[PDB]
Amino acid sequence: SVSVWDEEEDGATFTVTSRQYRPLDPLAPLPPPRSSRRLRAGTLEALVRHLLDARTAGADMMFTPALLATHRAFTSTPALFGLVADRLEALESYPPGELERTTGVAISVLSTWLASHPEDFGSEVKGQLDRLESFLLRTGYAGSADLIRNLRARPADPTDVLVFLADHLAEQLTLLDAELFLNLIPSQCLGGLWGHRDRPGHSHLCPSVRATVTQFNKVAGAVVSSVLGATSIGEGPREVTVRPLRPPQRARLLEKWIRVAEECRLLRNFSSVYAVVSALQSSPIHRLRAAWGETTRDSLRVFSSLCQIFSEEDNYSQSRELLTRSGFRGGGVVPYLGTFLKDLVMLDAASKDELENGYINFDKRRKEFAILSELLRLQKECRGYDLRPNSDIQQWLQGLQPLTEAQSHRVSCEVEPPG
C-alpha cells in the first residue's frame, strides 16, 4: 500500500509519497513506511534552498545529482554558484547552529559537483569563489580547505587497411573513440542544447558531442572508401582516384572490416561496431552483389550477427541491453552516442521547461538525468581501457579522406555496373 499526496512551500511544489511494506518476520510490527519527499517544481531560488537543505540527501536522494548535471539547461554554472553563496551569506545573521548545518551541506554539494563535473569550473566563477573563500574566513568555519584548493585548481591508401592486424585496428579505433567519449560533456547532449545545433549562432554549440559524431563518420567513411578502390581528391563527384579491384579482392576488404567490427565488439567499442556495420550496409556497398558473393560464409554469419545487434527493432533493445592472444587488456566501453541523443531530444519535446506559473519543471530534469547519469557511469567504465597509440595505424587514419555520398554512389556504379 502506497499513500501519495502533494504539498507546497515558499515557491516550490513537492510530492510526498509513503510506501508501507510488509514486515520481515510475518508476525512482527509494521516497519516504518519508506518516506519520500521530492521537489516537483519550483523557482531557481527555491531549488537552491532545497539543494542546501540537510534533509534532501536522505529524502529526495536524486535531486542533488540531477540538478548539478542538468542545471545548464535552465541556468549557468556561475549563477547557481552565486545563489549558493547568496543563501549562505543570508544565513550569517541566523542562529550559528543553522549556519553551521548549511555550510556543511554547501561544502558537500560543491565537492560532489566538482568531482563529477569538473569542466563546469573555470575563470567565469572567480568572483563566486572569492565570495565563498571570504565567507569561510568570516564565519570561522574550520575538507573545507581541500575544497578551496581543488576549486582554485580549475595521402593514405585506404586499401592499406589489409596491412594491419584487425585486432590492432580495433584497439587503435577504440583509443580514438575512448578519448572522445571521455572528453564528452554530458550536459551538451541535452535536447534543448543539441536539438538547437543547426540554428544560426549555434555553430560552436556542443563541441564535444560533434567530435564524437565526426569520429564516427571518419570510420564509416574509411570503410566505404576502403571497400571501393576509392581515394578522394576534392569536393567534386568525379574527383576520385580508383584502384582496380577484382571481386575476390574486394571481398577480402569486406571480410577485413567484418573482422575489425567483431574485434571492436570484443573490446566493447559499440560506437565503431555501428560505424563499420552501417558503412557495410550503406547503399554504395550493399549494391556490390559480386563482392558479397565472393565473401566467406563464416564472415557473412559474423556480419549478420553484428547487424542484428544494432537493428532498430524494438527501440534498439539489443544494443541498449549490451551496455547494462591478448595480454593485460583493461575492460572498457564506448557506446554509440546517437541512441542517447535521440532519447534526450525526444525527452526535450515531451515536456516544457516551465510550468504555467513559471516554475522550473524539475520532472523533466529528473527524466533527462536518468539518461545523463547512465552515460556518466559509462565514462567511468571507459577509463578502464589501457591502450597505446600505434603511430603507423594512426598516421593511416589521419591521411584518410572520406568520399562524399555522390562520389561513393558514382564509384559503386563504375566498379560494379547494374545489370
Partner: protein, 169 residues
C-alpha cells in the same frame, strides 16, 4: 497474419520531427513517455476497422551521422518527409532526402508524404511547396506542431499507402 506498418521520418534537426511522433503516439498522457522501452515507438492502432500495429523510426538527434539512414530506409515501408515552413534550409534539404531514399529503393511509387510542420514569420508559400509534392506524384498535407491538426491524418494516410503496397503482388 497481423499487419505491421513501418514508417520513417526525415527532415533537418529543428523541424520538430520529435513533436510529431510524440503527439501522434501519446495523447493526454504524453508526460508518461519512456524513451528506452521496447514499446516506445509501437502503437496498436485501428486503421479502417482493421487491427494493426505501427512502428515509427525517427532520426531525431542522429541527423549528422553518415551511413545509418541507408539501413533505416532499407527497409522501411512508409516515408514522411517533413520540412519547416518558416525556413528555407529545411525545405531545400527535401531534395537531398528525396533522392537519398531512392538511392536505396528502385521504387518511384513507394509510399511517401511531403509535409510542412510548425504563421507569423512564414518565409515559404503554399504555392511553391505544392509545386514539389504533386510533381513527385505525392499528396501534400500541412501540419501544425502543437495544435494537433493533421497529425493523425499523415500517419493514417501513409499506413493506407503501404496497405495498398502490401496488397500489390
Amino acid at each position: 497474419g497481423p499487419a505491421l506498418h513501418k514508417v520513417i521520418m526525415v527532415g533537418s534537426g529543428g523541424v520538430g520531427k520529435s513533436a510529431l511522433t510524440l503527439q501522434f503516439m501519446y495523447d493526454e498522457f504524453v508526460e508518461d513517455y519512456e524513451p528506452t522501452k521496447a514499446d516506445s515507438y509501437r502503437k496498436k492502432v485501428v486503421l479502417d476497422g482493421e487491427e494493426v500495429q505501427i512502428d515509427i523510426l525517427d532520426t531525431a538527434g542522429q541527423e549528422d551521422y553518415a551511413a545509418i539512414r541507408d539501413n533505416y530506409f532499407r527497409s522501411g515501408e512508409g516515408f514522411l518527409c517533413v520540412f519547416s515552413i518558416t525556413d528555407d534550409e529545411s525545405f531545400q534539404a527535401t531534395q537531398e532526402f528525396r533522392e537519398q531514399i531512392l538511392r536505396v529503393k528502385n521504387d518511384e511509387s513507394i509510399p511517401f508524404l511531403l509535409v510542412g510542420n510548425k504563421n507569423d514569420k512564414r518565409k515559404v508559400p503554399l504555392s511553391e511547396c505544392q509545386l514539389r509534392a504533386q510533381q513527385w506524384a505525392v499528396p501534400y498535407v500541412e501540419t501544425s506542431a502543437k495544435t494537433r491538426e493533421n497529425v493523425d491524418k499523415v500517419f493514417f494516410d501513409l499506413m493506407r499507402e503501404i496497405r495498398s503496397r502490401k496488397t500489390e503482388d
